[PDB]
Amino acid sequence: PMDTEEAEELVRQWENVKAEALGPTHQVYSLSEVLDESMLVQWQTLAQTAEAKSCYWRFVLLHLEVLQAHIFEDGIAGEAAEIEALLEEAAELVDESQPKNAKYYSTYKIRYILKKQEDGLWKFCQSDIQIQLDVMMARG
Amino acid sequence: KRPMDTEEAEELVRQWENVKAEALGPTHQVYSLSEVLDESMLVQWQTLAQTAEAKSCYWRFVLLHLEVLQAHIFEDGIAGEAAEIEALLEEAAELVDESQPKNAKYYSTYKIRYILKKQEDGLWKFCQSDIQILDHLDVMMARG
Amino acid sequence: GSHKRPMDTEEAEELVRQWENVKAEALGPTHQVYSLSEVLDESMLVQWQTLAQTAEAKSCYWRFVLLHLEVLQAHIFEDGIAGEAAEIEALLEEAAELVDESQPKNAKYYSTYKIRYILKKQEDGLWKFCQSDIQIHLDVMMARG
Amino acid sequence: RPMDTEEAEELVRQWENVKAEALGPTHQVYSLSEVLDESMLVQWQTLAQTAEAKSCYWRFVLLHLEVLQAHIFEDGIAGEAAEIEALLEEAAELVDESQPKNAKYYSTYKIRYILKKQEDGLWKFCQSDIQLDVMMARG
């Protein structure tokens, strides 16, 4: 059981942090804010990979909706939360080698697992998009 | 009743739509407007880019699809060669501001006509455009 | 400028509420003094550590009900390296009852008040409240913020 | 016929304390039987039984307890009754791990307590007139 307006502002904080990382700002450490554990690693590489090929993403989040926000704590150690977020976004990879070819428009739901830092920061842990280089790589 | 290359005309706008991004976006490159822009349309988007950059707000948009409806090269008076591109633009944007944790966004499809002036080097730049159908920046400031 | 940007109000409220949960644990009957070190350090710690240590040895505890908390302002400063600073002012509306055996009745309070917190990132990125400044035996007012 | 203000205050100060333990995590429904009778009983036993079965518990902080005019007149024939009017300024929080948030409140309110002296040395609160789960724990 979780506050959805907290969930909608926690992921919108993330999607905006994803954009700040993947993009011409090229801030990888921005991940360290809201990202941790498994998810930070892949997006740390991905933000640094696009920074390796000198490519960057332009993100626009059209709308998000939290379908189910729930809190569970497993064992004695850690607090965690699952957030199912219906996410409709579009992004284009601007590349120097193959300019302007890139684009995508996705409308999808995604399930986020995140840990509560002792600070209560609610950094993101891992996620997978539900099915029900590449420019579709950041659909998170 | 005059030609324009729809493969060229689309490229001018595809190269332009990226220029609006790099200028309004977090890189905030205002000089890059001067690359593809000229005359009134340069001053308008110079004002917007520099305005949003002074206010510490940066624009974000993805251009979904570009269609060229009509493209003509008329030279009008002897002064210079000109072009009229009617382009159907499908794009969405959210101006990213630190002030609000929620970024206001738009998704719009519209047809916007451009006029251009071929320079001495023979490169087409955008002097003026109209979209038929120190202040807060509306989400629709960047359209086209 | 000079690396000053607003913190997320969500980052703030869910961050602050963590301190209030710490204060209730440290100054309540559970007397978690270790809990103080979680979200506190440097100045604010030693102040509140000594209090929750005092309330432990004097066997007095604080009962907290915290009405709606609001974040008035949240900002991120820069320190040293590029990160690791912040100043956030929240409006705290709470009722605290100090249970002290010795005194005849537990004295409550009801105070709506604005307080300034200072928060740092320490080595690995994590935030801990460094100091607290309220703007306008044992007492019930010892516990505020 | 006005009550000793001490005689009245201890009656309510007890009830407020009885009310806190009943709706708290200790979830003592029996405590309502001590200091209540009739409507105060039925309404508050169902409520405490409600929160007990829903695993909800209230939290309470009573800031200031005050007595307005507290008067006594005999109940019909042998029984005796009393009116105690009290200003209650209290804060409370209903904690549900279910639901996103606990619902706090702070309410300063007048509530008329109609009591009867039980036959043997005892007083019971028999009525309250104030002029799922909500913050309905008041008075």
Curated annotation (Swiss-Prot), chain C:
Q: What is this protein called?
A: Plastid division protein CDP1, chloroplastic
Q: How does it assemble?
A: Self-interacts. Interacts (via N-terminus) with ARC3 (via MORN domains). Binds (via N-terminus) to FTSZ2 proteins, FTSZ2-1 and FTSZ2-2. Recruited ARC3 to the middle of the plastid where subsequent complex made of CDP1/PARC6, ARC3 and FtsZ proteins can form; this complex enhances the dynamics of Z rings during chloroplast division. Interacts (via C-terminus) with PDV1 (via C-terminus). Interacts with MIND1.
Location in the cell: Plastid, Chloroplast inner membrane
Record's function text: Component of the plastid division machinery required for PDV1 localization to constriction sites. Involved in chloroplast division site placement. Required for the proper formation of FtsZ rings at the division site in nongreen plastids (e.g. etioplasts). Inhibits FtsZ assembly, functioning as an antagonistic regulator of FtsZ dynamics against ARC6, by recruiting ARC3 to the middle of the plastid to facilitate its interaction with FtsZ proteins. Required during stromule biogenesis in the leaf epidermis, especially in non-mesophyll cells plastids.
What did gene disruption experiments reveal?
Defects of chloroplast and FtsZ filament morphology (e.g. long FtsZ filaments formed by multiple rings or spirals); elongated chloroplasts with multiple division sites. Aberrant stromule biogenesis in the leaf epidermis associated with giant and pleomorphic amoeboid chloroplasts, typically having one or more constrictions as well as one or more extremely long stromules. Reduced number of enlarged etioplasts in cotyledons associated with the formation of multiple FtsZ-rings.
Its source organism is: Arabidopsis thaliana (Mouse-ear cress)
Residue ranges annotated as coiled coil are: 81-101
- Describe, from its UniProt entry, the tissues in which this protein is expressed: Exclusively expressed in young green tissues such as young cotyledons, shoot apex, emerging leaves and budding inflorescence.
Q: Domain of life of the organism in this record?
A: Eukaryota
Q: What is the lineage of its organism?
A: Eukaryota, Viridiplantae, Streptophyta, Embryophyta, Tracheophyta
